[PDB]
Symmetry: C3
Subunit: 349 residues, 3 copies
């Protein structure tokens, strides 16, 4: 099953008392096949309460998605600063080469992020430059003679004041309090699909979401209730990177052997990733409340074609005389069978 990236394919870049940063394997490492996803990666970020992710710049456009917790993200330009209050379901673009830091101002609740990483330098090449003091503070890379001229300060002072502590450090109540375009929330609009059985929330390329147009990207939240099914469908255009945010379930992804059809099975678990390539029929069942985050690559004009249920059911659209010829049953047996599923998009499993 090449479409399944289990949670352990997340390489820990950094772990301590206060949080962890994990990067998912290059999609195009294990097999070719995702040569079109070669310039995307996922990062999981988790931080304990009253913590700060210290000044760093990454050589990638990032789309942040907050799964849990509350953050102040501060983004620096050369001559300017902007900070954004981040909530559950908030997404924002953290552009390439922006020095930024990330406060978890909540008192009890962990901050959990997933980032879509779009590198700028080499397809999928994740590069991070640490301004603050680590083993890897980049300012230390400059020779003494460059620093001394650069800062017009004696090296010894540059060393004592700027140069010589982990990457996510505790911040105190006084520092939090003293710290004091916009995020688009997946849920501050009516869900696209909503049902006793599930809901799908989606922000897609439209004027209104100019950044999603430019990156040609959708961010979906899919909820499947215990014992429900996301009814079979394919995306017309989009390649969906599905991260399992919470819950367990199972997934039937139909592709080819890679003209024969192969069903590709995956147990689903927190932190697991599945690629659903465009046009690949997929069915999803939750054994507990399942919360999926989807990044839809090549999103413009994407279109969920369901193969059962009343809405968004492309089979319904087949003219009757062609229905007669495409399936073994009569028009009346086919139209009746298709009416037996009263639900749309989601349903009992």
């Amino acid at each position: 099953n090449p479409f399944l990236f289990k949670s352990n394919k997340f390489l820990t870049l950094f772990e301590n008392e206060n949080g962890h940063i994990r990067l998912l394997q290059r999609f195009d490492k294990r097999s070719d096949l995702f040569e079109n996803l070669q310039n995307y990666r996922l990062v999981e970020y988790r931080a304990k309460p009253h913590t700060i992710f210290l000044p760093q710049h990454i050589d990638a456009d990032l789309i942040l998605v907050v799964l849990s917790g509350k953050a102040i993200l501060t983004v620096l330009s050369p001559n300017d600063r902007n900070s954004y209050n981040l909530e559950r379901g908030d997404t924002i673009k953290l552009p390439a080469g922006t020095t930024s830091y990330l406060v978890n101002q909540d008192d009890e609740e962990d901050l959990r992020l997933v980032d879509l990483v779009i590198p700028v330098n080499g397809p999928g090449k994740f590069e991070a430059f640490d301004l603050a003091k680590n083993k890897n503070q980049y300012l230390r890379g400059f020779s003494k003679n460059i620093l001394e001229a650069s800062y017009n300060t004696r090296y010894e002072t540059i060393e004592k004041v700027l140069l010589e502590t982990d990457a996510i450090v505790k911040v105190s109540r006084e520092q939090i309090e003293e710290l004091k375009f916009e995020p688009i929330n997946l849920r501050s609009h009516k869900p696209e699909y909503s049902n006793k059985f599930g809901k799908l929330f989606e922000i897609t390329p439209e004027k209104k979401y100019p950044q999603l147009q430019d990156l040609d990207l959708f961010v979906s939240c899919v909820e499947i209730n215990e014992g429900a099914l996301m009814l079979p469908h394919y995306n017309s255009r989009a390649i969906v990177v599905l991260l399992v945010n919470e819950g367990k379930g199972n997934l039937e992804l139909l592709g080819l052997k890679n003209n024969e059809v192969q069903r590709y099975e995956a147990r689903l678990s927190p932190g697991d990733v599945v690629i659903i390539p465009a046009g690949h029929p997929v069915a999803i069942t939750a054994s507990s409340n399942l919360n999926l985050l989807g990044f839809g690559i090549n999103a413009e004009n994407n279109e969920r074609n369901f193969l059962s249920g009343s809405d968004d059911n492309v089979i319904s659209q087949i003219e009757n005389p062609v229905k007669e010829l495409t399936f073994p049953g009569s028009v009346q047996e086919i139209n009746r069978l298709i009416k037996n599923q009263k639900q749309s998009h989601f349903a009992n499993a």
Copy 2:
């Protein structure tokens, strides 16, 4: 000769009494060189009268070109349906992941298509998903427990009504009759070039052809009469995939050894493909009436520079004192020689 793809490089995907579908080799298989054409393929489609190409979706934008015959193409969205009457010289975009079917409603005449295939999933990766009942009907890939919940019908009935016949099947007079943006025809406008000897019809990127802008594509029809020559020229920007639709002839494509100049020769025949990379001078002669279809990749601002004849002759544009220095003859000998070819674009061979 790496630029010549003979008709036999078409792999038959499907053949029966009623029609055939053929896919051309990956351009970038035999040699690197066409690394820029790696995400295009050609498909030849032929179907007997009163036939239907049953519901299928392909994971590629397709540009259909009708060479012969007449079709009703029906295109399905999740909640909508559209059918288009297709004629000789009609082109239309059949977008990725659209379930569609294709009727040949003519009584006597075969329907002949060429498709440009722009895959969505892997460069040049042709993927087709069969909704109707074949060996490869994709609905069969789902486990019993998913289908039964999905359709809310007992598996046995799903099997009898939907699941369990070729890919192009006969349709009857009653079914045809009962079956009852837009296509852009290459010829419903004045041909770009027209002459006793040949004609070139062309739709190019302009506002008016928004789809050709977006795909950055031209579709040309080139006719060369028995005993005529398409006068030497190069395209400034475009990479031309030339399919021989009917007739025989010969082609001199000048490139490099791959600073030396190599003449690349090809006998030309129905179903043969030649790549003319940008800036590569080309001359074409018909031994019978030659009908070429050209797909022009990277089309925006393309520009046919002829090297002989009165119009579109870049040599004419050389200022005289530079003419003196660029060619061995005098200004008067050069301007006179260039006047000896009264014809433009096409001429006697």
Copy 3:
């Protein structure tokens, strides 16, 4: 040091009494890493006074930058001609597949160009087609029977008048005199940065520079005075191809081993090229007056973040309580240290 392409990595395509044309190695040859620069090359052009670069077309968009001298560039369309007066600091797009020739009309001063080459046919594949008479005049590639029909002239005359001299030939005072959108000069606007120590001139993607938007490109001129330093900075988005036009100096480019930080050192000399990938901190010192030309790939919204000096200093933008936590010193020691460098962008070394 993979980022340093010494002047000798320029392959001479053509040399004689009258000038030379040189092409830089494929960036992506020696190492992967510049897989994003794979479709750019640099060409150095030098020509003696009263010389013409004879009719040729290249299968690449070219951005010409005049470092020295004065030229008349004549650009041919099929039905039209345009010539541009070119001066020190003038840049112009010479589009793919345009037959063009280049006069040095100055009497004493050599014409010196650098071209950015964006090939159209194969990533980085430099292809040149010589219309005028060389070993490699492309018109000679056509068989006798094609030329005779093509020009409607006996081959012997085609041979004597058009076919059968170097690539850059002397032109006479009478021919120069007789020879008789627009160029954008780097300096016909206030320099972006200007100082006792250096200046940076820059044309970037904005409406006004539609061609730089379309190619997504900046052209910079950077001057560093003897004994001055270009203060440490990174570009947020842009990948900078830096050509040393005149002078000597030294460069500290900080990257990774390819999480550790490596300082990448280079002596700098006329004709040397350094790639500064996005987000890679860089410091530059001149030992003589240093004149750099930079082509900035992926330029849109690029942003020079300085790490010292008063303007464009991203460290300044860190809120004080986070300054406390990111560097070992106190707020007061850090803000004071950052004030010690009064200069901006450039400074004494």
